[PDB]
Amino acid sequence: IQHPRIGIRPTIDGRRQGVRESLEVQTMNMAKSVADLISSTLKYPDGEPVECVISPSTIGRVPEAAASHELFKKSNVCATITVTPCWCYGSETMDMSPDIPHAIWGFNGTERPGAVYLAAVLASHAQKGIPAFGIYGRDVQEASDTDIPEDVKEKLLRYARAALATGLMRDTAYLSMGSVSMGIGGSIVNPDFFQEYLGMRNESVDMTEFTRRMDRGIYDPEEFERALKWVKENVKEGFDHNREDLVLSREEKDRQWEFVIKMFMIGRDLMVGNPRLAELGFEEEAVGHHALVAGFQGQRQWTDHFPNGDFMETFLNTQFDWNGIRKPFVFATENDSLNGVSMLFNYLLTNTPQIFADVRTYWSPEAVKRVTGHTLEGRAAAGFLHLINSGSCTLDGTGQATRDGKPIMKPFWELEESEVQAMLENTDFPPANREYFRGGGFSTRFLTKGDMPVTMVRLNLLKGVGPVLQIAEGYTLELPEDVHHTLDNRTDPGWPTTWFAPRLTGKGAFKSVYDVMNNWGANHGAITYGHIGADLITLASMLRIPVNMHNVPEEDIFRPKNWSLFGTEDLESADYRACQLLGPLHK
Amino acid sequence: IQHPRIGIRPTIDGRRQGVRESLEVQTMNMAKSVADLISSTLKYPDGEPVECVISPSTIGRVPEAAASHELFKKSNVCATITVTPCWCYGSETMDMSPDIPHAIWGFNGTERPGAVYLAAVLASHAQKGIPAFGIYGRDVQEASDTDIPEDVKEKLLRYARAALATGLMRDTAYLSMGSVSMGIGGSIVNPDFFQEYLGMRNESVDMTEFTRRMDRGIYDPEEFERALKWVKENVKEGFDHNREDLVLSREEKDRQWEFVIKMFMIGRDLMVGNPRLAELGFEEEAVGHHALVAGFQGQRQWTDHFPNGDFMETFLNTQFDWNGIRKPFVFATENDSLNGVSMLFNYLLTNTPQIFADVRTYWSPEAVKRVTGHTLEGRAAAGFLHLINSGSCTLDGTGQATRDGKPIMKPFWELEESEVQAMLENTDFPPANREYFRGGGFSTRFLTKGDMPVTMVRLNLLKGVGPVLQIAEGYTLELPEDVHHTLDNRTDPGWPTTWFAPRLTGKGAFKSVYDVMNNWGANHGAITYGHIGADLITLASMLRIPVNMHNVPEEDIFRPKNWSLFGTEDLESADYRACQLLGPLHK
Amino acid sequence: HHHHSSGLVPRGSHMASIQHPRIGIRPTIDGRRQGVRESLEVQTMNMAKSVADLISSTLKYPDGEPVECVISPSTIGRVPEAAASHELFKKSNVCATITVTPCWCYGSETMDMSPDIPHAIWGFNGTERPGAVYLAAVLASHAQKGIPAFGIYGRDVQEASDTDIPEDVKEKLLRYARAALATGLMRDTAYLSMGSVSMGIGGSIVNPDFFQEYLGMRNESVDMTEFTRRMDRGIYDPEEFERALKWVKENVKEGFDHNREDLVLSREEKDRQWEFVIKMFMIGRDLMVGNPRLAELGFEEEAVGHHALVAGFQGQRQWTDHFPNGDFMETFLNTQFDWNGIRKPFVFATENDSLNGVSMLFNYLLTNTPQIFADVRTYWSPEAVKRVTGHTLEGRAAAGFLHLINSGSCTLDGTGQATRDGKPIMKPFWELEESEVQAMLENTDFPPANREYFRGGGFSTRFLTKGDMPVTMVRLNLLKGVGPVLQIAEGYTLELPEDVHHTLDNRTDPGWPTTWFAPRLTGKGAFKSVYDVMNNWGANHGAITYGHIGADLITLASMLRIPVNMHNVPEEDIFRPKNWSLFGTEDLESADYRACQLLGPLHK
Ligand SMILES: C[C@@H]1O[C@@H](O)[C@@H](O)[C@H](O)[C@@H]1O
Ligand SMILES: C[C@@H]1O[C@@H](O)[C@@H](O)[C@H](O)[C@@H]1O
Ligand SMILES: C[C@@H]1O[C@@H](O)[C@@H](O)[C@H](O)[C@@H]1O
Ligand SMILES: C[C@H](O)[C@@H](O)[C@@H](O)C(=O)CO
Ligand SMILES: C[C@H](O)[C@@H](O)[C@@H](O)C(=O)CO
Ligand SMILES: C[C@H](O)[C@@H](O)[C@@H](O)C(=O)CO
Ligand SMILES: [Mn+2]
Ligand SMILES: [Mn+2]
């Protein structure tokens, strides 16, 4: 995990003998306010505070712009924010970097035309096709007012979180383990997508590597022993649903517990390397694949023979193991790289682990009544979705973490001992259903606490357009206990469950919960704690991915200012137009 | 100012031995009705009545179409209107000129298929990609009914005014004086825009020319003397806000009054020439630059040394000076050529002078209450915009002209003596603020009467798309006198002020007055008397400039009939599509 | 360094200066370790080391400094080493990449993904390991992923443990480096228009999209009133001025006055105009690069300049109609010395012909030699020469020639008075001897401007470029809907017989400077005849450099995805990214247009 910085660029009126000198402090202050707001509010996936850099001076004329540019280049700046309380020149003071986002915050004061620079400099951005965000506060502020108003903070932080996400993906890899899984689209990996849109590389390992490392001892054995121990004490084997002649013996299941632990270790070591492997004389294997995100093909070839990926998938995505509480490793079942990236967007925006799930069933109220007798009320009133992965899910997905007595998924550094324990307690691990996975393994079974605000997310590849994003904000549901159990046993009671109801709007594909599912573009979703729809819209716009479907309210949509020039009425079409024309960042 | 004509083309059923002869008069009459409606209702910027030409005969077969075409070519026709009460052939009778607008008015009668030609001939236009407007009245009329119904007149006149505007720009120049002003986008002049969209040329003069003409006596000295005299008697020097050591002596200010007068003269002579200059033996300079519109870079290089452009800018845009009441010369501060064209659209559509202004502040109700104590009511109820140029503004912008006891900006030929006097009385000219303009000059200070209906307009260049138009209909505001003075002194009390509130619609960027400002694409606006939004939409469509933002009601949107084929539901997207595909007129 | 109040003032010596873009050198290696990788480490890192030595010991920045190279933190075997590398280059100001290897490496795992900079790959032509094999493989990935890369592959199999770079490889590495560096040097700098459009000249209608999209460059502009403001307000170094005036009096011979009788200026006026043009120089120079002395004299805003690597003075019409012209200014900006000493030139366009300026800059940055700005004035056919002079042309002039002669100004370096091995050349400033500076000054005078064209006055530059010097005439033109296209014509300056020279000169504009130019004809395309070459020249201006740099420009242009519409470079010298050949191998021109078309400018 690198530390992309935000460059704060304080532009000023270049005229001296009065004007410039009188604005120096006020201008430099706006920069500091912003550096501070970011560095005290946002954190990298590793929990360290975000870092900003200010331009070496205020920017009144081009050479100051150049020096600012000089400094940012060697400072690993992934986005810029310009701030000004006055009029400044524009093409003379603007950042020209075409490969990063930019925001301009123009102080809404009267003494000095701050808003006038803002709009002028953004005209130049639109005219020169360098997308920039415009941040203009609602209320005239006093020339001395030191505060960042609330509307401005919201825009600054949305921007910064979105920008940071682009900053963190850049130059990292997606690691495929295997390749295509059962003809699943997102598992037919498209490097052009990663390269053009995300600035990302593609790495690739045949699953035989897993076997190789196992046969040849290419993993930490002190670590294996500590892990076996930890797993026995912490991980409860669940009910075996397997038919008589497929039920594995206790010996065989025990051997498989060892195996799937080894799998988890190897996956980790693949993604990020492991110094320990150099100590054991596997100097090459030790470096890893530089993967911020990976996936495991699994079915059919691997899972037909060897224990499945559930354990590995589950724990890679979970914020702890025998080594302690930690960042997750964003990881995709069935090597669904599109779902992986969907999860990755969510993760970089929140610093929270991410649920991978099949969108399994839509339950209409009529069908629940028929099958269960129960009439749905509250959030489930309008029907809902059975989100359930084919074996694995982040343990944080239980929703056992708590804030203000409500369920959440937390960044790892905020997790309490008791919370980790609760996730463990409320999960068991049923043997793999051997008709689907002759090779065995152990799935992950739990039920996500209800009444938890979440966003469900999917990237899809549309031929001849590229990626499109769909967003669905909603809430998890708790159902009556009898209702849950009827719908569970009828579906896959061996796998983890989340009951999801999306917020309806009466607009678009959100007229009804059916319409949502009927417009979902894959069998998979990434599900995050939090209502992060607006954040995703912004990120999408930074990366020029059109948003085909969302239920974020129009007022929170925050896009580079030049999107408006493609239209203000038909935001969706304006969006496709802008993305179409600008194309990906790294064409 | 040339006199573009409208070609009226009366098409008829070619079948004789009865049918044709029986329709001759009725058809020829429709033409005359239309020629008359236009020539008695519309006027050129010089006040002369618009001129029409009818085809040399009715058009029943191609050779009549050809003769019509022959005649129009040598008749300086800038748009056509076909009129018919009957069925006619279509591809046989249609105008093929691809570089001008066309309208078809099909009489809504029953005896004879007039509406049937209308729709057929427009199909051909759409099929052959020659955009045409369709003008069809709501109510069946009697075969003898000689009247142009109201819905038809509205469409005919909207079309004609829009068409005439394209007619008047064509083959004229924009003159830059200087080039880029303080990195302002619209001042980085794009000749492709002028050439491709407006059929216009680009002329260019370094500001040194101004100095040259001054040192070398290249202006009318009899005119200078009459002007000095007139300015002393009519122009009141305003309060000097300059700090002690910058305040200029009375001698020095007097020298500067002479200078800025000379500036005004030279600008005029540059734009349009001056026979007087040939008499004084400056035969070359006398021809001018053929500019229908120009701009003056001003800052930073000129204004840092010499008296600023305010006076010149102000009077060029004002409908009188020491030589009497007259057409304005559309003229842009800071050489903002985009604002200049915005003003020019407005001007050719109305024959009224045009306010150039920075969109300075958005005043929310919360902020007014905080700063002033006052709670806004009436039109200002929902917040408003401080429109204020950095020194200059058409004196007609005072709003001292009156119709039915309401403030207006009038075409010059309608101005009364007392009205001109009132504009003068209610304006003074404060010395230039020398921290911004070391070189001095005198700004233009007044406050625009409130409760005046206006449209604010801006053209923006969107990279890889081209120009896009934004329209904002609203009203000027009168604020409580204490309220005005607080907001003024706090901003720039030395410059001219217009308080603007746009009409909100709940659609698009017009949900709130903030949203309007937040979606304004430049620091500048052109502001015209009148609600001319619908006229601008039409003109935009003629020139294939997409409209990105407007608050004109959907029912008044009047575009070539083939726009509907790009869609009837999503008018904005249909619009971008059509403009995208057709491209500019002179590609 | 920071102002006591707000914000920046020139460190300095000057404010904006010549950047030091690095070439990043990536040694890639086989990832396998139970013997193989270790066995190749040394030979691999040597390749890298020796390439960095080749570049740093041969090539210099415009300021005379050795070019800087950066090596990857390690040999590159798997992605994470590539990431460590990219991580280093991102903060080391790397303008281009060279991958070297003697062995097989894992293509897409090891490749550089930067889309905004050139990449070359050199595969050791050895037998022991698949070096070329990596070369072809990784180049295939570049073409598949649309990230252009150059392929350097030596003609003759080398022994493992030969550490000499073969001559043919050297040629390619240095052509690449030279071109790559020109890209890196232009990037993030600005073009400053002084004035804007001059007499309706195309390239003087400055096009920011070109600068931004193609060159990664900014556009600055001041109206020429800024000169008058500075002159009137003393915004220029007056101590400097006094030295300059004295040096000019001593070193600048005023030329014969050709003016119409009633337009001839008095000695008093001429002397005033002399002071004026010197201040114009100082001011134009100050505008471009800034001046610490301006800060000292209290003009802190001004002191900073316009970050201008290249600039232009509009002049005509409205300045030169009134004040002395910019000939003196344009001349000395492009000349490699003045009162302050021998010095890099400041690349500078007459008539604000920005495209000429960019053509000049291409040349400057490829060669470190100053640049001739010319009107391509007249094509002299042998028949017209015979008719007009009675002389039958021979040697390099035999097939006719072009009269190259700017409308007043030209680099004094373009006299061709500097010398190497008996031959006339133009040199980088740091190689110029005293004799040579002196020679130039002695072979140039400065005629009063022609007041029928320049009522304001001033002084033109007049000299004759020495014949028999290899030169390249260059021009970028803008094609609507395509973008920039580049035309190149290699040839020689000519020494005409003296009678022929004076007859032709005096019919033309003997007040201006002359280069007589013969382009190498090839029988191909527009180089069938000297006439054909002029008839296909796309502008009234050209940029002429010493040397034959056609191949270097071709490589440059491919890097910036600028097509070459016309060049006389031998086909075997054409050195473009490997993927250009996937666009075709017979029609190199069309392939080049398709490739530029598709890839587009670096920074769209
Ligand atoms: C149950 C979990 O086991 C290990 O991860 C411990 O290090 C954690 O802190 C937690 O107690
Ligand atoms: C005050 C104005 O002065 C001159 O323009 C007169 O010709 C006008 O008619 C008017 O009176
Ligand atoms: C005319 C003189 O020529 C050389 O002597 C230079 O070293 C001096 O600086 C001056 O340029
Ligand atoms: C268990 C199932 O057969 C799985 O193989 C498959 O349905 C999925 O997980 C859906 O992608
Ligand atoms: C007076 C100001 O400094 C002006 O130079 C500038 O703000 C404008 O007029 C805005 O375009
Ligand atoms: C004297 C003429 O006007 C010259 O200035 C003219 O031929 C040129 O320089 C063409 O660029
Ligand atoms: Mn699945
Ligand atoms: Mn302004």
Ligand SMILES: [Mn+2]
């Ligand atoms: Mn010339």
